[model samples]
Target chain A: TNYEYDEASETWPSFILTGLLMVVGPMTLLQIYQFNEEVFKNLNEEYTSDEIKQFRRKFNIIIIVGWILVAILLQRINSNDAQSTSHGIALPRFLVDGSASPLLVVCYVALLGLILPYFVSRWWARTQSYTKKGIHNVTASNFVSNLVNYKPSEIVTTDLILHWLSFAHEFKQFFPDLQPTDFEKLLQDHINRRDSGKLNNAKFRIVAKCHSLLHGLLDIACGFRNLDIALGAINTFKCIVQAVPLTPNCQILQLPNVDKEHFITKTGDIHTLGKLFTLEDAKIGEVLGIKDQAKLNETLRVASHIPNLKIIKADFLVPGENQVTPSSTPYISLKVLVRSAKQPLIPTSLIPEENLTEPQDFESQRDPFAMMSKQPLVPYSFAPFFPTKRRGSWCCLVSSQKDGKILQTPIIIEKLSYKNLNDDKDFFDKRIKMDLTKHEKFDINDWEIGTIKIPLGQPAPETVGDFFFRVIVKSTDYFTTDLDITMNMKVRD
Target chain B: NDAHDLYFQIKEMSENEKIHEKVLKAALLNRGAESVRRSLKLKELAPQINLLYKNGSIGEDYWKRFETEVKLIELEFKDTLQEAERLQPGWVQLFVMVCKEICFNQALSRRYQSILKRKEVCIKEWELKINNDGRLVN
Candidate 1:
């Protein structure tokens, strides 16, 4: 909390120097090594782009084959049908006693491994979409950059020293005996009402006194019995004191206006001389000069295939100064950039009448509904049903899901309906068209659509558990001229 | 099996039931004149184990393996006290105690862990020096 720099101490600079040395010296050596003739010329200069692409394709094949081999090997070696070993894992017991097929078991596990991150990442992506605008807020960047390269025409003549001194006195009451030179100067200036314009805040004396009294109580007698209640009471009082209700005659000192940049979220007031930036449009990358827009675009190109997403926004900030801080006055009030859906296609009205109740944050989560349920609760379903051999053919399918007393609960499919406002009729007809122009390389035939059966019952009433499902999708492929079958499920609560 | 059993067999537990009813009648107080004295002594303080698993603690592998029963218990308690007024005079007192215990314990543990981490660094450095030098103890 005591973050003030001491004029007499050389410790901070030394700490900074030590930190710099640990990173820069080694990193410089590494770069130099990389540039060395033996290292540089040895790197594959002759590697053509086509060759590299082919190599990557081969490498990916190896990885997949390696994984398949690994699963098969594990299935063979640790087969439940094999004589039991002393190793007392439940997998062996469950597999052996239950006569669970090894291939199916391996497939189930791999499916789970694939499915879990997809849903989690989907959930993460969904939650992230909500915060898309706030995430990219970089008004702080414009504020700071404006400050750093800025030159004030004339120094605003207000006694900043007097303000500091008053703050110091507030600090002084806490440690009354500790007299620093700066602290004394503040107390003297406040009493004398010198050239310092800070005396205006003296009107807040009653509020400050009440705050001090509360602080004193906290310092002396705060304990488990009533400390929280006391804290809440003090906070309420502080808020009441700070709140400025609008009236016809009453006006806040232009400082408190949301449109103006002089307001403070926590401790300090900052003024911005730039265009107003919405919390969503502010990208921290624009502030740091670290963002490669092309690279970001490419990342999104791949990410767009994350088909569930409606919008996305991302930002990166300089490590220490990105988040808000108490002590240092930051020029950029916020840093983050976001992308998101302008509006969801399915309005709340599309949700069935029977499902309607109170509008909760997470519509699926509630206590009374959970308690009233006679059946078990299960995980949510978010990801697609089956997997394709290639990224190009990936799709999801599900048959049925039920929870509590709800039955044959058909999914509320999100409809995408609109005309493309484009001249290119054939190509851009659908916003979510599969980029299958390069199907000759993979020899992909048209996609196969189908279904699979799953058990019908209410999930067991419990905190957390999986209600299993089976799914299948058919598609034709290049190398084998055979249809690819993909199977999967959805987990929800 | 004993003389008491024989006496109970001869008389009947209905007599005891009548006696219990009479005692209840005797202890009944006038509702209008009564002081609504209330006191709560908390014996159980179960934290929201799932919240602790989700946002309360960080570490992916550890959280995923958390027992479902523990989460259910937390949900049950949280559901019981969801409504403000339903957190009656007694429930409010108990919940306050539970929250205080959890917050204080987490803070205290963090403090200890901070000290322990520093001590661990010192011990590791000492171990390196001991290894480099000809140690008589070793």
Candidate 2:
């Protein structure tokens, strides 16, 4: 209890400095954050998720702590001055300090409530999307971000709004000043006019579906960078709108100047747009019934607009710098190269090689916060329909005859034209023994992994085997059968 | 290479010393083995006859062989995917795995019922051969 000090240098100076620090602290913070908001207006104000919920949680704690600390400081300051007084009761600092008005000090403490929250937001602002702070657990904000991030479907009615769709509408506002391209004024006006009998029903819904899918696409793309799903949607968007009508086995109808009268079906084995492009000019001439060069060029011109999606190679890879050993885990690796007359080809020259190999550290594929998405502006599914009162158009389904189930859950493709050496797929097999220090009855391994399977003949084994997979683009087009792109590959364990 | 690859691989891979494998599975796996062979015989026999028939000119013997080949081609694919289906019920879960559909298929089952009605004529004489060169149907 060495409580007596003759006089520590006056706390009034220290008190004034702290009082000033509290006032300007939150102001500078808030203003700096607002400054970033101004910058983003010229950039992306149209984002897919909102951060208000997170800020609310951050703010609640900061306010509680601010009140606690201010009370402590006030009592401590008063206790010092009370040493000179008779009654032990603390005379408040506001009551003692001369220049500080009692009312002003009360107001100052009250303002702290508001100011501390501003400081929390300010720190949140300075931390770039370049870091974990840049990342968000979107489910905390919007339930649809949760829904889209997880699974499943429904129709294009205005009665109920979508989750990712809601997330977009909440945070992503229209940039009226940023060179407004009114896909809205145009599309909605057409929709209004068509419903009012100003326009025809023909191609009306198809146009609207493209716009609807674009909403889902932009939401998914901006919500999180699901590149595969984004690309798959664009592929669908390109196919369904204006270029082709999607009736099964009749994709050839998509070629300009060719219709029912030509009555041409498969010439040889050529049926799908992918198969037709492989035919030579004369061969396609026979198929198109256009022996003449002019219309043949026209057919070729329109045909080339079809996204030329070729799977370059697919395999199981151990992801090791060294060759695969049984000790290391493996994943399903699909290397897809997309090219079309509709879009640009090389992602290699646009980006460096290290990103191709090393890329970002592990995280959910559905994370919108991932800045690594750096995908190109545009190009490119849903097969069949969700089509009518349907929901799952934005997903690309990969089917393996090896197992009839989808090898990977359907994912949204989020790009125009980009090459991907992706580890998006995996055939799940391995299981780790959980609760270690203690363990389950199936005490397989405390340290184990997820990529594994059988020595069974049907499944691909340690030695490479020719395997086949078909990717069906589901729910993008109402009239068409789902777009199916099948490929054959040989991958080893 | 075949549906019974499931069967052959089980034989190749299962522990040999286990009494379950060394004796039991030795005969157990063979149960579906014979059914699959008999089912596949009807399918494989036709191409064997048809693809080689252009090496025929004309004869009484040749005409009879061609007719027998015709009978086979008509009866071909008689129970194509059936034995594989029964060997592993509901295994594939795909549309092709519905093996019972063959037993209920309108055209195929109509022929089977027709053969069943024909078998009624045998109730009286119990003919060694039904009037001509008729064989067992089942």
Candidate 3:
């Protein structure tokens, strides 16, 4: 293996130089790569998906083909040396030394040709959101380089544990700085302290960690300038805070926002972050059917500040007990009975009188909602949009009497809360936000603008007529202001 | 033209084939054919609808005839999705193949149906309102 002995005297220096060249060759290519990274940064702003794919494929091909050619050329030169060594012509001094073992050089070249490109290209491909164009577009490079290095996650609360575990697989990948083992350790400590009764610092740490995590996500979303993604992160963060058990100290987890703009865009303003600051003192409210009146008011007060928040229009969703008409079965109907201007304005599109009032329905029992109906008030439908596969929303275009212009009102049905309401035989009196729509399952465009539907499997109410529930609709333009509509529900006899 | 005709035939087969057959066919191939057929049909439908819609060839009578048809297919499509949801994870792949075909077909049919209905209301300047406030007398 000694290069000095193979060349013995005169050729020893030359052999050492060739070995140095082999190392320098790869080092020079790395320099070129660093420069190309800079070039790509400039070109990436306008990059399309096709271009990214093509660039990735071409780069891998070039690296592979170039190394293959290098290997063949090296082999040819080495073979030539066996014959010419006596005449002072020899194979690459790096490969042969004076010994017959050329396998060392071959392994070195193979690593360069195969392993380096495979992993480096993969790392580079993952730097941008080119491949993953859907919901979780937070790139790893942003996480690895910027956020993970400095930010810490030392504390754990039940709220943190719940949300973190739910999204942890993806979260771990994006936030590698926060080790999963460390989180587990902290979580264990949290569990141990919960029953110990002296848990002030742990409570503070959990709130602090939660806030830091939200801030980090908001900053990243801001850097990328994706309000939708920011909103999703915020919504997740909001839900976690909502899930926390009501305590005077836990109330600090609210998102506090003033009239300031956290993020502004050409399409709309992001008031979510701005309002989160105001949430510092906010109490947990009607979210997920948490029924502490004092806590609910505090929570509702905080929720009132969320800008452009969409809420369900109907107060109570009644599943019909018996068939009202032969054409219409006992069904789940959303009562849109808001009369006063003082109430939060919910622009409702009453499915035309001919279609909605004229009850007629049909279908095979195999159908989920029996939603095959022309009329709006069918056996199992409140409107045209019913029997959806997952949670859904309805955007209604209602005309403003003041301006004579139409406004887009989104009436959302959060998932049903039967268990939370103790399966109240009469009516459910809780209000919940609609679950976030999955961009992959239902594209944002697929959500019908003027369609409303009841969530599946809710038991029909016993005393359905003259039921009222409160509905809150936030103005898209102003996130802080909400329209409180007292909706009246009357089931057809 | 032969390729074009074959494409149409494949699209039709994709829409009507049994779920088991489609799954078996897809498993035999490198990638699923249902996705490709769906994409092509969607591309074709957009232009076709735009042409008919702009020309006013779709009228109230056409919408009335298809109203029931739309409801039937829509319910069937929902049923297909619901059925897939009830399947085990090991069996989800086949259901997914079947679901994609049904979804594509239903969405296309619904798109045209909605356009017809939307145009009818626009031309007639009709307002969709509840006949009476649903207030139970105390």
Candidate 4:
């Protein structure tokens, strides 16, 4: 036992070091990971399902064991020191040695509880729109970091306030020496007016932005790569916020076909194939009359024939020609009714009349150039432009004219609402923004393996519009390679 | 080439039979197959058209088809998992531990009802089966 204390004390320094080392081990083993993510802003790409599951299991095991070891060692140290002293309840030698104060660390952790929200809220505020768009690209690692490292459970709200927002309110008092910029003052004044009505519309936009941004960030955070779930969530968020008002007890009896420039009103006590509609929130067993436990089980047995993907909530809507920005904030429209699932039953009427002639061509043609070279971003390189594009503006809804008539509109957004949100605002806020800050640093070396550099001032090998366009755009934006001779980009000049 | 073909890769399996020729899987392996089969079968047969055969009475092939149908229905439930009212929404998961305990009585009754409808006997089967004491088959 005496030797155990000695061993632990000796091991403490290494334990702390090796915890970091072990973390690097897996990252190092990741042959694909070769660059510091900081070097390339878009390094954290969508992890494959196999990779994600593998890392998640490993991470969980490591943390669990690390926590267990730390606890045991601390307890052993405490008891050993206590037993050695006249007072058998004394603290550990580390506590006595004064390398650091555990209480201060606790206080710091407590401070995190307070500070995390403020910082996260700032992060949300700063990258609100972009984050919302990138929600689906969020990974579990960063997601966990955002929540845990930032807002620890011990801190309270009052302990941390919006000092960043507050600073602008009385900026003149703090910095009486200098005059504030007009634009900066104006922005500060607007933030100051959060309590007033000016913040309402802005807040609404922010909330909307936050919803999508968080949704985008969350896609990374929540491992939201599935097209079904991504689309479902995007649609549901929009729909819940701003669904076209259906009359009392009136389900969508008839969904207009924006593709066909036609409308169909369905009346049915029972659902038939072509006119079938799932009640947006319908469940499988209930839909199939298998509510009983046994029936559900039996149904599951039958279902064993197919691979189960994530359950996606989707509704059919049609789109109009010359329509851009197809998706909106609350609800999205569909091109066709989801007729006859599990079968190749696509209604050609859903395709626009103009494109109808060339639909088969569209189906057959794959961009041959896409396969000739490796993707610029490859499987991962999740730079900003790299969107899976799962959740887009699914426009095809009917916009109701003020004359009390429904006009099939050209834009729509799909928003899905699941019961998977953090309910308690305060607790959930902490839980949600858990350890984000910790993940801000990434092992780029692990991430950049096989990332052969394209020669400077030349278009990367893979010729095409999107990839090359992105490369050109990023190069111009970041490196200022396209600046003319007269254009002075030098900050000193 | 086709979208559906993306899910199954037979060519790779043929090349390396030791590894690939064997059955492939999703997490809800049996459930997915069953669901697709049943969803397809259900798609084929009209909704109202259903025939309940006695347990093991159908030939192995037919029984397999029936099992496939059941699995497909279960898959739909799993696939469209909008609600979390139950753990293991499908029958494969449910029956793994208590296959008989939970599903036996009800399934037997449903089978009985279907069998009764097929028979020539007009009067209620319950009336004929019950003794004076009003118990079921001795």
User: What are the per-residue Cα lDDT tens digits for candidate 4 across A99-190?
Assistant: 67577688788789978888888977655322222332122123322332231112212101111112222233334543435323333333
**Each predicted complex: what DockQ?**
0.01, 0.01, 0.01, 0.01
How would the docking of model 2 be graded? Answer: incorrect
Which runs of model 3 end up more than 4 angstroms from their true locations? A1-97, A112-168, A171-493, B1-138
Give model 4 RMSD, 1 decimal: 31.5
Q: Please, what are the lDDT tens digits per residue for candidate 1 over residues A424-489? A: 222321233355333243221221111112222233334334333322221111010111222212
- Candidate 2 local lDDT, A1-493, one digit each (tens): 2222223434544455477558656865776688001111211112211231222234335544655666666676667654564332223344545566677778888778777888878887644221121212231123222323231122212212222322323122232221112333323333222231322221233343445445444333323323344443444453433234223444665444454445443343445665665556587777677677865765564454333443333444443333344334444444344333322233234333332243334553233223324434332222211112222232454556664533433455443332221111111111222323232322222111111111111233455556676655433422223445655545533
Worst 10-residue lDDT window for candidate 3 chain A reads A378-387
lDDT for each residue of candidate 1 in B1-138, tens digit (9 for 90 to 100): 112233233235446555443332212211101111100111111122233223222123333433443464455344434422242444445544554455455445656667655544444433333434545342
Give residue B136's lDDT in candidate 4 (0 to 100).
54
Per-residue C-alpha lDDT of model 3 across residues B58-137, encoded as one tens digit per residue: 32233343345445444544543454444344555666566456656654665666665554333333222223463323
By DockQ thresholds, what CAPRI class is model 3? incorrect
Candidate of highest TM-score: 2
